[PDB]
Amino acid sequence: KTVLDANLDPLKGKTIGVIGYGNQGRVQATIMRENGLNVIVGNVKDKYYELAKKEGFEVYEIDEAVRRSDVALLLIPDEVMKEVYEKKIAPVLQGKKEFVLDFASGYNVAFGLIRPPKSVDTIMVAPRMVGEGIMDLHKQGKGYPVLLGVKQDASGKAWDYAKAIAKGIGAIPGGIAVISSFEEEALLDLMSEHTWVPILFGAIKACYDIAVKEYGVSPEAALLEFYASGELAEIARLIAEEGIFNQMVHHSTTSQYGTLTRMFKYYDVVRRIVENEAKYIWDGSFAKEWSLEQQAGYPVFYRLWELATQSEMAKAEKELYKLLGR
Amino acid sequence: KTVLDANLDPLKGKTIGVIGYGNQGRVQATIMRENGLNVIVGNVKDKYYELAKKEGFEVYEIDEAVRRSDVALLLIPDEVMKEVYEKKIAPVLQGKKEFVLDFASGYNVAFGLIRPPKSVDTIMVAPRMVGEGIMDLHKQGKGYPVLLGVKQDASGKAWDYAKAIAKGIGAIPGGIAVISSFEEEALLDLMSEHTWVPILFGAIKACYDIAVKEYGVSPEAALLEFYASGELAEIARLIAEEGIFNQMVHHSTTSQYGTLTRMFKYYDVVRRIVENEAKYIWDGSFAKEWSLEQQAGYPVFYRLWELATQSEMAKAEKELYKLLGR
Amino acid sequence: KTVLDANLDPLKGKTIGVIGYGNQGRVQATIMRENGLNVIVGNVKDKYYELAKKEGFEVYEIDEAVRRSDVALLLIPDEVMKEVYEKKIAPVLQGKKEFVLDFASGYNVAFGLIRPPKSVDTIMVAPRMVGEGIMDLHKQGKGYPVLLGVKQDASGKAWDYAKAIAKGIGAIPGGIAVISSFEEEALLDLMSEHTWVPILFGAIKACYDIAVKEYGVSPEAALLEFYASGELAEIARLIAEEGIFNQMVHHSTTSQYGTLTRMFKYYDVVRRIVENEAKYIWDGSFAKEWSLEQQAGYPVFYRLWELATQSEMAKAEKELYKLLGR
Amino acid sequence: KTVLDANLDPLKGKTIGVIGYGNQGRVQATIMRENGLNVIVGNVKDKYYELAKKEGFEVYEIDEAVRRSDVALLLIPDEVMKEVYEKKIAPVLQGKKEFVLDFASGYNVAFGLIRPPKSVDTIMVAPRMVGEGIMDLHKQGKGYPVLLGVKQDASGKAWDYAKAIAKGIGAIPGGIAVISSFEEEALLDLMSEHTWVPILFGAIKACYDIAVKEYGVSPEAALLEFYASGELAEIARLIAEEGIFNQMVHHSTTSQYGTLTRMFKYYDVVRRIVENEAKYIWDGSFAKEWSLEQQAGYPVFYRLWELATQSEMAKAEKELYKLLGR
Ligand SMILES: [Mg+2]
Ligand SMILES: [Mg+2]
Ligand SMILES: [Mg+2]
Ligand SMILES: [Mg+2]
Ligand SMILES: [Mg+2]
Ligand SMILES: [Mg+2]
Ligand SMILES: [Mg+2]
Ligand SMILES: [Mg+2]
């Protein structure tokens, strides 16, 4: 039901352009040069221009590297992807006949902010790691999971181009390739940022104001319990390797009774928050909200970085980290 | 306002018994034998009986090691601490004249479940690490934070006994010693288990049921986003070393806008949960609830481990971990 | 999908102990002695000690009858089952190698109050009759329904031991054997006692206080309508033989219009009571409530038998039954 | 705690440019030319181009007057300040080394709409008068209050540059200089426009509709009571000179009982409006609302000037002012 291996025969002998030499563009082009392809770097005249030339490539302009290529990969950030697509790549794709356009994110295509023509294939390969964990894993010989999806179907060879790049960048064999969509890629990525990450940061911030202002706990002793000691980054290492419920048997018996009995008690309070944030993404309403913040000139993003770093909990964290040598 | 150094002169030449050779007893007795004290092991006739004799000690009985000692340390778990105190140590402490009783937890004394006489000192030294991170730190020459507190004051040397054991087990110099209470030690330890740990596990469990049952995401692709990839144990390593708001500048600009604007929106919903769980602990009502679960014979603890490990999210995690080699 | 016949060949030639000679122990051991097995009685030195010796058996002690046996049946009440298991049977089961432990109830094992070792099989055969209707049925040659379930699986012959005792006590052939669980046996038994039996007794008690105190009906004429005439035990005999909706065509046409139109009107009021009482059982919360009533010394059970038998409806029932010769 | 005098020695001998010759630019440059500085006018080629040349100055271009200057003052309106800063002044400030940028408003800098470099000082001098009351008070020899604030601190001379312009434009000596912020300057200015000014205009508009439509008061007699007689501009002249509670003793005794007893009765109704409007400003949400009204092309500003000047209260005010000779 999931993919474990593929071919590399559909994409042999042809030119594989890579636009952008940022963080994701360096690792994915390094493992393709070892597998023996024709990989060229299309980069803006930047500081990355020299650092991609002395690493053993040939570097060009963006709209020129699409003219030579037959399969291009758009590894540039999502904030600048829209205004450099219409100015550089969009005049060139109408001068081609067949093309394969590849995306590492699913945000600008699921919400219709970038609409390629009908003469091109649009596929997606999306790694679930960070990039500074992938180069440190390629020396071993293992892989990493990816998510595949196809939006516009032109050739009939569309699904067998996507599996081959999953085997060309060093994900399979050794990892999992799951068949997904463009809309299910963008929903799951913006559900982590909206549902369980701001409830976690807002509950450690709320434990600090109840302990210090109501019960008279010292401001230097509340920090060492909640997050300034690395006990949250120790019980999270066991989740990745043993399970989420099976890492609980290495705790006290008093700890398992208070965690299990309260997880089932506050379950339908936090379920009503996830139902409302997933409806706000799926209709396209968050993509309109963040597209009008970038046009007003970020007035709310600026005032919420001021109110967070100049608070009571962050002003006391600064001194305690000026005392443990960090 | 906090302690950075102490002496070892009040506790030189005298016998320092250690009751229990579990996890916390092995590390704390090892760093005291190197500092040059008279450390004896009081252990039950167990599997730890041999393993503490071949490690270079002298093992005895529990009520005999209190007769020889003058400063005893009770590094035994809190579940069995009450019924082995009244049967072994309580008949002996009335036969002494002066004694220093030391506790690594603040649960049984803050709620009055163990009440020592008026002829004894009662102090507390409570390390904020795990034990399997402390022995791996002793070869460096560094320290770790501790919390000090005094319940019953007999000598007048009561506060200067507590600082010396903080320097005798290898915490200071190099770390922090914070002055605290027995009641503020037990409040902060049961606020992690009741407020932000079951909110976090119940929000990843609720993201899985909304994504799979409403939007048609695959059961093997929802797991790789939320917790089965080690991205929760990567962004938690930066919290311990850089801060909680300063680790966010290594994320995307779209990720900081969705985290900051929702952390301030769901702040008074999760603040009403922390106000109610801290009142339930401070009155002593959780200590009555967990003391009557152990007497009925754990009927609710047994039925909540069945309903958690036989759910929809844990039955699919078993298969995916039977596919990535874990 | 259900069982209609089995064998008796797995349990021939071996000793079948029966613990307790109460109501369920007398009937089940009588139909097994006729089928030709080795049935011994393990009874406390009681009044049943003589009455099981003159009925043609050999009576022993409880912990001695487990030493001789290989398949034991625990037909003792659930109130005393826990404190006579740990004192008598639990020291002996570790001295065996293979054993089959059999239960006629599913209460103490589903909620984890009795946890046998991993070296033993645990099965269940649960008859849905009374015992004083089974001995009066054995002369006919018919059967009665039973429920089978297996908790811990050791041999692989575990499911074929359970079917054979269903045929050995005289249930099949001629009746139904349904495959069930230990948790589904305890849920359905405590749903009759909590949902539809106290609603029925509390609605005849509420018809008596509205008729007598508001409309001036005589206290001796309200009783003869609601329950003191045997019409509730006449329309219930047709439910067992004809159906629950098909017994209504032997009533008046005015009676079927008032029963059908009000059964659909009060259906979601009584559905909210059953949803809440089934959640209170499944989590294990009723087993904690009844285990702490037996430890306080029954103070609420004593005061609710006083308030029920000294009420207005029970004081007037006493005189009317002192007038019809009952 | 407040400032009463300063120096003029940090800013002697150097060039003080003034951008814009509007209302605030004409008065502030006139009192600086008398104090003996080097004041040049940077104005757009406008109608003010001639009117600032015949008044005894030297007029230039905007980006040329920043090249000559060393301390520039931006006395231009806030609506056009953003799009003439990035086109003219922003290319020049990177060609300098040290500069002092001065602002008479705190709107565009507090909300991050104009972010100067790190090589420049940013200060603020904000007068609390009108401009057509300041020139009429320069012939007397008096002063007027101002608010000082510093955003980015570069040289260490930043706070003593701000006090000297407070003495150089003719505020101190004789007036008050209060030390404030950029965020506290923008909060207090938009709290007058949002809280107590639209409540006042909406309560005289609501007195007119209740008196005329319910009680049959003439439309020409309701106007002469509420605002068309100059009694609101008479009891407001005593607030500035005598107090807000001490001007009430020149009223009737019936008037003081109805004002005092209702001011304390409707106090928590109007306190809930001020709490909500001050949270909407501080987060930066009003700055996003007014920045997207100017981009849609003012569709709501146009329709609310139509609905206000074509109402029942403004159509009858037009005729009554066509009868008293106004
Ligand atoms: Mg993620
Ligand atoms: Mg992302
Ligand atoms: Mg903790
Ligand atoms: Mg603990
Ligand atoms: Mg029943
Ligand atoms: Mg029963
Ligand atoms: Mg104002
Ligand atoms: Mg203004």
From Swiss-Prot, chains A, B, C, D:
Keywords: Amino-acid biosynthesis, Branched-chain amino acid biosynthesis, NADP, Oxidoreductase
Pathway, per record: Amino-acid biosynthesis; L-isoleucine biosynthesis; L-isoleucine from 2-oxobutanoate: step 2/4; Amino-acid biosynthesis; L-valine biosynthesis; L-valine from pyruvate: step 2/4
Segments forming domain KARI N-terminal Rossmann: 1-180
InterPro entries with a match to the protein in the record: 6-PGluconate_DH-like_C_sf, KARI, KARI_C, KARI_N, NAD(P)-bd_dom_sf
Gene3D superfamilies listed in its UniProt record: 6.10.240.10, NAD(P)-binding Rossmann-like Domain (3.40.50.720)
Transmembrane helix in keyword set: no
Molecular function terms, GO-annotated: ketol-acid reductoisomerase activity
Pfam families: KARI_C, KARI_N
Catalytic activity, as annotated: (2R)-2,3-dihydroxy-3-methylbutanoate + NADP(+) = (2S)-2-acetolactate + NADPH + H(+); (2R,3R)-2,3-dihydroxy-3-methylpentanoate + NADP(+) = (S)-2-ethyl-2-hydroxy-3-oxobutanoate + NADPH + H(+)
Coiled-coil annotated residue ranges, if any: none
Known EC number: 1.1.1.86
Stated family: Belongs to the ketol-acid reductoisomerase family.
Protein name, per record: Putative ketol-acid reductoisomerase 2
Lineage: Archaea, Thermoproteota, Thermoprotei, Sulfolobales, Sulfolobaceae
